Amino acid sequence: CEQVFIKPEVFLSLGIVSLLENILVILAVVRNGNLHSPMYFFLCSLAVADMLVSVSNALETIMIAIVHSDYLTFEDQFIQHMDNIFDSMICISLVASICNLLAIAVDRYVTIFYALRYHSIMTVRKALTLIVAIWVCCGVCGVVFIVYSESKMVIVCLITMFFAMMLLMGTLYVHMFLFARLHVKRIAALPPSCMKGAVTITILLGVFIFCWAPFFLHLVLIITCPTNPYCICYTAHFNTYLVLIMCNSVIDPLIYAFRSLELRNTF
Amino acid sequence: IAQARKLVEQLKMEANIDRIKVSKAAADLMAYCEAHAKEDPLLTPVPASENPFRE
Amino acid sequence: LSAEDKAAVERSKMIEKQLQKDKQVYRATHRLLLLGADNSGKSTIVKQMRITSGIFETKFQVDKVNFHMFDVGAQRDERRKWIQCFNDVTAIIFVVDSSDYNRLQEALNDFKSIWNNRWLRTISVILFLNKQDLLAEKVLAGKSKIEDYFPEFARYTTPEDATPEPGEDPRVTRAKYFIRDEFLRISTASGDGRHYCYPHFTCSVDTENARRIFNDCRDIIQRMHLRQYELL
Amino acid sequence: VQLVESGGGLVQPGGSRKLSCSASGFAFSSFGMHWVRQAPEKGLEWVAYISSGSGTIYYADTVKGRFTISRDDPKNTLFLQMTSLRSEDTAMYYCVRSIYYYGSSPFDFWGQGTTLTVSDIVMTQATSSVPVTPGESVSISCRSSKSLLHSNGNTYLYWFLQRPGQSPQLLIYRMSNLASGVPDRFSGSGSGTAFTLTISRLEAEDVGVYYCMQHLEYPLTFGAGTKLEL
Amino acid sequence: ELDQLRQEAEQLKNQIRDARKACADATLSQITNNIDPVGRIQMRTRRTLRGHLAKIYAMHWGTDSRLLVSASQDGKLIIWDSYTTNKVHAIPLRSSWVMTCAYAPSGNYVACGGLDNICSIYNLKTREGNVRVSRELAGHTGYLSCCRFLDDNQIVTSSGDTTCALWDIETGQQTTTFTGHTGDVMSLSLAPDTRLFVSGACDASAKLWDVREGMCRQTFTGHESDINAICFFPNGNAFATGSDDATCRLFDLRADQELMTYSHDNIICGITSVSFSKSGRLLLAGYDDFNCNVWDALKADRAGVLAGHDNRVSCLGVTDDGMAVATGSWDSFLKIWNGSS
């Protein structure tokens, strides 16, 4: 119903945890040479994006705490010149995280279903090309954050892009699980259960939902129903919503890269 | 039969071979090691100026 | 910095460029490995899908996927040291002489040796129970029965999942499936999802043998990638 | 190995003409080529350069915006497109092969030559003629402006010998080595600025003109010659 | 009968073991207990050599301590320039399963061989520019595990059949053949005067051979499993061989005995390459646990470890200047090491 003041004593903890885990991932990849395949570069792009997100939400809070403390007095002229730059960084980094996750999902689908025509087509060069392209587009889509600024239209594109890259990342994993189901049915039907697949897909999709869907439902309603008192009582919890985003950035290096035997043995 | 005869003959040539003490072999090996210890680069590293792999 | 040094660097660049060209042919060429008895018919299948010396390499591509199949010839009885080379291949193809009742035990001993090696733990195995028509003659024209060399055959009836081709006696199906049952008996124990065994029935004249290797190798790659993503 | 090149003759000033060098007998793609020219009664003079892979091309100051060099690896031929020819381009153009890897021997084969007639580092060979009688040990000298001893140990001085009516022929590469088919008599020594080529026992097939070339940096510059008469 | 011959052989073996046990007054540890140990040898990957498409099985140093041949399952031999990390030549082979390679002392030739039963000789310094096959030395009936040049015209080989041989290249005719073994011959090391050579063959036995004589002039039977590498101490009087168990042992020809086992309880993987340092003071050993250990040939205590590889070391060679060590591993990378001061 009303805005909240979650202590910045927890953003420090989340930032520390995220930075620690993601640095470990990005170091593990470069400490092994049998991890210079496309998948372990997409994982690194995701990890750097997650660090960037966590530091962005940490830096806005640290700046707010320093300015509000009335220590090292600063003018309010440039505060309204930095409160928009920091939010622009949020926009770029958020799009980067989503797109890295989609890169992982599509790469996995292509490995499974196009298995014998993948080492012919997915060189390291193309993986680097794609990572750089994604980052550049995420940069331009955060430059648009301020140039065309925010006009109830950039809200539409962002909403629809999120609620399309949720359907795609559900479709790819449901399809992969059903295929794994067929395989497990055939493996068992021979001279001497879908539990593991179900748990993998459920975790990897529910983290996406319960860690991003609240924020985009926020944004959908505050550019849909910004008057209805129920809607306002809803939108009051934006602080807990960014809490959820940082929880996503903490979990991501744990169910995408730490669930890999060789990278788990590296560190 | 022929293989056994060959084995017996080979053992016969094996027996009739001069041998020395183990202490002499150990002394000879340590002597060689000490004698060339100045010109062994990996054991006694050389200045980087003379090293062709970093100059 | 000197001119001769620059030209040597340029020569090295051209060599490295040719090697990078040869990566794309090395990767995207699935090696196999053909192991089978002297009477099996290894080279028969080899020539089929292709159409003091040691390795007998052969090639065949199906639906734009390269396969680079091997065969070890004049090598000593022990398979110990050089099987290490054939680690990191997509499959091992195993061919038995199905008709010759007496040598099946030697075939199974070889199968068990290949299946439980210290290497080859991650490498699957394709069977080609070869010369089946010969078994059709052998057991259609009544003669020395399978029970003569096999005790357990007396208590054996055809499993439900069988797919007898039309014109196949119910006992000849037991003849065809008893060897498959034996080899899958060897396969099912001693192995947990890291690799599998793909039985097959092949006469000496059949032409659809390259496609079976295509499908089987696709399966191996898919199950590998699915386990890597913990969906299986 | 066998290199022959053709395409020369009389051309009026200001015209153009293409020289082609048809290689046959060696792996043309692994060698970089050169063009060296000899004025009617003068010494040698470097002209162009194209490397393996066609990726590096150098020229001389007096032909740079005027000549171009190209090669055709599949056809095993090498070109030189001369344009706007001036009277100072009357020369005997040669087609020299050179391979550069560790321990190679650049300038190891020189073609026969084609005749064309139109209507930075200084290498000094102070001597220009030496009488000599067979069986006497000769010593031919050559001086340099800069020091040719690069920091990596090479000295990059080359010695040649072109007999009365023949194409040149490598004797010494990098100031101290011997080409493939050269007698043990020849031997070269030097310090880094001053150089010598010492024949031990001269024979009637050793008379000619001995040339010294530098290869420290482009352009490559020659001496003037040291004729041995008999 | 055969029983009499068997009893005679057993008596002779008892005699051999009695003679070996008798002349064994001390052990190298007892003599070296007063020798000042070397410190921890720190060696850093000065320059990594990249470009092989798959695993490396063999490397050899040119006698000038700058050039380097390597063999890979790809079907290629690369001649590296160590100092500049440059490719000099790249030889495409006929058979993909190369298992050995050698660099001729004169720098003119390079050899290779493998599962294909043939040893191939390549002419590096050809008037036409490319590297060509000079001879294919056929005659073996098993995979060829090691090739070493004695001169431009003589080469010694060892193959899977219990057999090493000396070849005359200009004829291709097996000047001599060496018979005694029971298993697969794996390694080979010429003496630093091409007069003798040694080989260990998949039966826990390594035999010294006379090249001009053929006779197996010595034998050594200390090991417990396959022998995978062998080399001489520069003296020519010692050789140390590493086995498929976790032990490297040092043998002396004059004593005709074992001297010192370089083993540790913490190691279970086998040894895949062994090479001595220039002074006979450092003994490098390649292991299956992805890293090369450096031992001390006199004190038997690790003085280093070359942890820079991501897979099984397969090959290991020290220059003739003693100034570098190169290591090839199944990760297709080749790394050159030397210390810093």
Q: What is the CATH number of the domain that holds E229?
A: 2.130.10.10
Breaks (C-N over 2.5 A) in chain C follow: 51
Give chain E's contact residues with C (Cβ, < 8 Å).
51, 53-54, 73-74, 76, 78, 81, 84, 86-90, 95-97, 99, 115-117, 138-143, 160-161, 183-184, 186, 202, 226
Query: What is the rounded distance in angstroms from the CA atom of residue A201 to the CA atom of residue A204?
Result: 5
CA C37 to centroid of chain Cα atoms: 12
CA angle A179, A181, A185 (to 5 degrees): 120
What contacts E329, CB < 8 A, 6 or more positions away? E55, E56, E290, E309, E310, E311, E312, E313, E314
Q: Are D26 and E128 a contacting pair at CB < 8 A?
A: yes
- With an 8 Å Cβ cutoff, is C11 touching chain A? no
Q: Which of E328, E320, E319, E323 is nearest to E338 (CA)?
A: E323
Sole residue written with tokens 């089987």: C216
Alpha carbon of B2: minimum distance to chain E alpha carbons (Å) = 10
| Sheet of strand E196-200, all strands in order from the earlier edge strand to the far edge | E187-190, E196-200, E206-210, E216-220
Query: What is the rounded distance in angstroms from the CA atom of residue C59 to the CA atom of residue C49?
Result: 9
Query: What is the rounded distance in angstroms from the CA atom of residue D215 to the CA atom of residue D205?
Result: 27
Query: What is the rounded distance in angstroms from the CA atom of residue C137 to the CA atom of residue C145?
Result: 12
C231 by DSSP, 3-state: which? coil
Task: Name which CATH class applies to C32-228.
Answer: alpha beta
Q: Which residues of E67-85 are buried (b: 16+ CB within 10 A; e: fewer)?
A: bbbbbbbbbbbbbbbbbbb
- Count Cα neighbours of D216 within 13 Å in the Cβ-side half-sphere: 24
Q: Which of E177, E135, E165, E140 is nearest to E152 (CA)?
A: E135
Distance of CA E43 to CAs B34, B41, C101, E336, E337, Å?
Answer: 21, 11, 61, 9, 6
> Which three-class secondary structure string do you get for chain D?
CCEEEECCCEECCCCEEEEEEEECCCCHHHCEEEEEEECCCCCEEEEEEECHHHCCEEECCCCCCCEEEEEECCCCEEEEEEECCCHHHCEEEEEEEECCCCCCCCCCEECCCEEEEECCCCEECCCCEEECCCCCCEEEEEEECCCCCCCCCCCCEEEEEECCCCCCCEEECCCCCCCCCCCCCCEEEECCCEEEEEECCCCCCCCEEEEEEECCCCCCCECCCCEEEC
D123-124 and D138-144 beta bridge pairing? antiparallel
For residue E227, give both structure tokens.
């022998």
Measured over the CA atoms of residue E297, residue E302, residue E304 and residue E306, the dihedral's sign is positive
- Encoded amino acid at E22, one letter: A
- With an 8 Å Cβ cutoff, is E128 touching chain D? yes
For residue D225, give both structure tokens.
């010659």
Alpha carbon of B42: minimum distance to chain E alpha carbons (Å) = 6
Torsion, Cα A100 A106 A111 A114, to 10 degrees, reads -150
Q: Which of D184, D74, D105, D191 is nearest to D143 (CA)?
A: D191
Sole residue written with tokens 């985009």: A216
- With an 8 Å Cβ cutoff, is C88 touching chain A? no
Sole residue written with tokens 């910004």: A226
Sequence ranges of the domains in chain C: 1-31, 32-228
Q: Are C231 and A192 a contacting pair at CB < 8 A?
A: no
Residue E306: burial class (beta carbons within 10 Å; 0-12, 13-18, 19+):
buried
CA D40 to centroid of chain Cα atoms: 15
H/E stretch holding E274? strand E271-276
H/E stretch holding B47? none
From chain D residues 167-186, the ones with a CB under 8 A of any chain E CB are: 180
Q: Which of C208, C188, C189, C206 is nearest to C198 (CA)?
A: C188
Query: What is the rounded distance in angstroms from the CA atom of residue D50 to the CA atom of residue D79?
Result: 10
Instruction: Please name the chains neighbouring D, where neighbouring means 3+ C-beta pairs under 8 angstroms.
Output: C, E
For residue D155, give both structure tokens.
């000295």
Query: What is the rounded distance in angstroms from the CA atom of residue C60 to the CA atom of residue C207?
Result: 13
In contact, E89 and E79? CB cutoff 8 Å: yes
Q: Are D100 and C14 a contacting pair at CB < 8 A?
A: no
For residue C68, give both structure tokens.
């680079």
Quote the domain boundaries for residue B48. Answer: 1-53
Cis peptide before D219 (omega within 30 of 0): yes
Sole residue written with tokens 């006929």: E94
CA E99 to centroid of chain Cα atoms: 12
In contact, E154 and E195? CB cutoff 8 Å: no
**Best residue in B6, B29, B32, B39 for a mutation probing chain E (most E CBs within 10 Å):** B29
E117 by DSSP, 3-state: which? coil
Measured over the CA atoms of residue E297, residue E300, residue E302 and residue E308, the dihedral's sign is positive
Torsion, Cα E119 E124 E129 E134, to 10 degrees, reads -30
H/E stretch holding E136? strand E132-137
Neighbours of C143 (CB within 10 A): 10
Measured over the CA atoms of residue B23, residue B26, residue B30 and residue B32, the dihedral's sign is positive
Query: What is the rounded distance in angstroms from the CA atom of residue D34 to the CA atom of residue D27?
Result: 16
For chain E, how many structural domains are there in total? 1
- With an 8 Å Cβ cutoff, is C11 touching chain D? yes
Query: What is the rounded distance in angstroms from the CA atom of residue E151 to the CA atom of residue E212?
Result: 14
Q: What is the DSSP letter of C72?
A: B
Sole residue written with tokens 């073994």: E181
Q: What is the DSSP letter of C161?
A: T
A145 by DSSP, 3-state: which? helix
Sequence ranges of the domains in chain D: 1-119, 120-224
For residue C127, give both structure tokens.
């069977």
Measured over the CA atoms of residue A103, residue A108, residue A109 and residue A114, the dihedral's sign is positive
Residues shown for chain C: 232
Domains of chain A from N-terminus onward: 9-266 (1.20.1070.10)
- With an 8 Å Cβ cutoff, is C52 touching chain D? no
For residue A194, give both structure tokens.
């879908």
Sole residue written with tokens 């991650």: C122
Query: What is the rounded distance in angstroms from the CA atom of residue A177 to the CA atom of residue A183?
Result: 10
Q: Are B37 and E47 a contacting pair at CB < 8 A?
A: no
Query: What is the rounded distance in angstroms from the CA atom of residue E98 to the CA atom of residue E286?
Result: 19
Sort out which chain D residues have CB atoms less than 8 A from E68's CB and list them. Answer: none
Q: Which residues of A195-223 are buried (b: 16+ CB within 10 A; e: fewer)?
A: eebeebbeebbebbeebbbbbbbbbbbeb
What contacts E169, CB < 8 A, 6 or more positions away? E121, E134, E135, E137, E152, E153, E154, E155
A67 by DSSP, 3-state: which? helix
| Sheet of strand C58-61, all strands in order from the earlier edge strand to the far edge | C30-31, C66-69, C58-61
Q: Which residues of D23-44 are buried (b: 16+ CB within 10 A; e: fewer)?
A: beebbbebbbbbbbbbeeeebb
Query: What is the rounded distance in angstroms from the CA atom of residue E23 to the CA atom of residue E15?
Result: 13
Residue B1: burial class (beta carbons within 10 Å; 0-12, 13-18, 19+):
exposed
Instruction: Pick left, alpha or beta for residue C144 (phi over 0 → left; psi -120 to 50 → alpha; otherwise beta).
Output: beta
Query: What is the rounded distance in angstroms from the CA atom of residue E92 to the CA atom of residue C189?
Result: 43
**DSSP per-residue letters across E151-210:** SSSEEEEEETTTEEEEEETTTTS-SEEE---SS---EEEE-SSBTEEEEE-SSS-EEEEE
Instruction: Pick left, alpha or beta for residue D174 (phi over 0 → left; psi -120 to 50 → alpha; otherwise beta).
Output: left
In contact, A47 and A257? CB cutoff 8 Å: yes
- Encoded amino acid at E55, one letter: K
Distance of CA D92 to CAs D64, D65, D80, D207, Å?
Answer: 18, 21, 13, 20
For chain B, how many structural domains are there in total? 1
Return the CA Rg of chain C.
22
Quote the domain boundaries for residue E62. Answer: 2-337
Q: Are E66 and D26 a contacting pair at CB < 8 A?
A: no
Measured over the CA atoms of residue E328, residue E330, residue E333 and residue E339, the dihedral's sign is negative
Neighbours of C59 (CB within 10 A): 12
D129-131 and D227-229 beta bridge pairing? parallel
CA D81 to centroid of chain Cα atoms: 19
Q: Which of C20, C2, E110, E90 is nearest to D30 (CA)?
A: E90
Query: What is the rounded distance in angstroms from the CA atom of residue A65 to the CA atom of residue A54?
Result: 17
Closest CB from A115, A192, A197 relative to C188: A192
Sole residue written with tokens 């995280």: A97
What Å resolution does this PDB entry report? Answer: 2.8
State chain C's maximal CA–CA distance in angstroms.
85
Q: Which of D28, D37, D31 is nearest to D80 (CA)?
A: D37
What contacts A210, CB < 8 A, 6 or more positions away? A244
Residue E189: burial class (beta carbons within 10 Å; 0-12, 13-18, 19+):
buried
Sort out which chain A residues have CB atoms less than 8 A from E333's CB and list them. Answer: 33
In contact, E215 and E257? CB cutoff 8 Å: no
D44-50 and D194-199 beta bridge pairing? unpaired
Residues shown for chain A: 267
- Count Cα neighbours of E209 within 13 Å in the Cβ-side half-sphere: 26
Neighbours of B46 (CB within 10 A): 17
In contact, C68 and C57? CB cutoff 8 Å: yes
Alpha carbon of D98: minimum distance to chain C alpha carbons (Å) = 10
Sole residue written with tokens 């070339």: D213
Phi, psi torsion values for E288, nearest 5 degrees: -80, -5
Residue D98: burial class (beta carbons within 10 Å; 0-12, 13-18, 19+):
buried
Q: Which of C49, C126, C57 is nearest to C91 (CA)?
A: C126
Distance of CA C154 to CAs C106, C145, C171, C224, E161, Å?
Answer: 21, 10, 11, 39, 44
Query: What is the rounded distance in angstroms from the CA atom of residue E282 to the CA atom of residue D190?
Result: 40
Phi, psi torsion values for C96, nearest 5 degrees: -110, 160
Torsion, Cα C71 C75 C77 C79, to 10 degrees, reads -60
In contact, D158 and D144? CB cutoff 8 Å: no
Distance of CA B29 to CAs A260, D108, E304, Å?
Answer: 50, 48, 21
Sort out which chain E residues have CB atoms less than 8 A from C18's CB and list them. Answer: 90
C7 by DSSP, 3-state: which? helix
H/E stretch holding E216? strand E216-220
- With an 8 Å Cβ cutoff, is E289 touching chain B? no
Query: What is the rounded distance in angstroms from the CA atom of residue C135 to the CA atom of residue C152?
Result: 19
Query: What angle do the packed helices C170-188 and C132-140 form, to 10 degrees?
Result: 130
For residue E159, give both structure tokens.
């193959």
For residue E106, give both structure tokens.
């004169």
Query: What is the rounded distance in angstroms from the CA atom of residue C222 to the CA atom of residue C216?
Result: 10
**DSSP per-residue letters across E57-110:** EEEEE-TTSSEEEEEETTTEEEEEETTTTEEEEEEEPSSS-EEEEEE-TTSSEE
Neighbours of A227 (CB within 10 A): 6
In contact, C133 and C204? CB cutoff 8 Å: yes
In contact, D183 and D198? CB cutoff 8 Å: no
Solved with: cryo-EM
In contact, D156 and C2? CB cutoff 8 Å: yes
Residue E10: burial class (beta carbons within 10 Å; 0-12, 13-18, 19+):
exposed
CA A134 to centroid of chain Cα atoms: 13
Instruction: Please name the chains neighbouring A, where neighbouring means 3+ C-beta pairs under 8 angstroms.
Output: C, E
Q: Which residues pair with E294 in a beta bridge?
A: E284, E304
Q: Which residues pair with E104 in a beta bridge?
A: none
Direct distance between the N- and C-terminal alpha carbons of chain B, in angstroms, rounded to an integer: 65
For residue C37, give both structure tokens.
């008895």
Query: What angle do the packed helices A238-255 and A79-113 form, to 10 degrees?
Result: 40
Distance of CA D224 to CAs D41, D118, D141, D142, E237, Å?
Answer: 11, 23, 11, 9, 59
Instruction: Please name the chains neighbouring B, where neighbouring means 3+ C-beta pairs under 8 angstroms.
Output: E
Query: What is the rounded distance in angstroms from the CA atom of residue C61 to the CA atom of residue E93?
Result: 22
Query: What is the rounded distance in angstroms from the CA atom of residue E33 to the CA atom of residue E29?
Result: 6
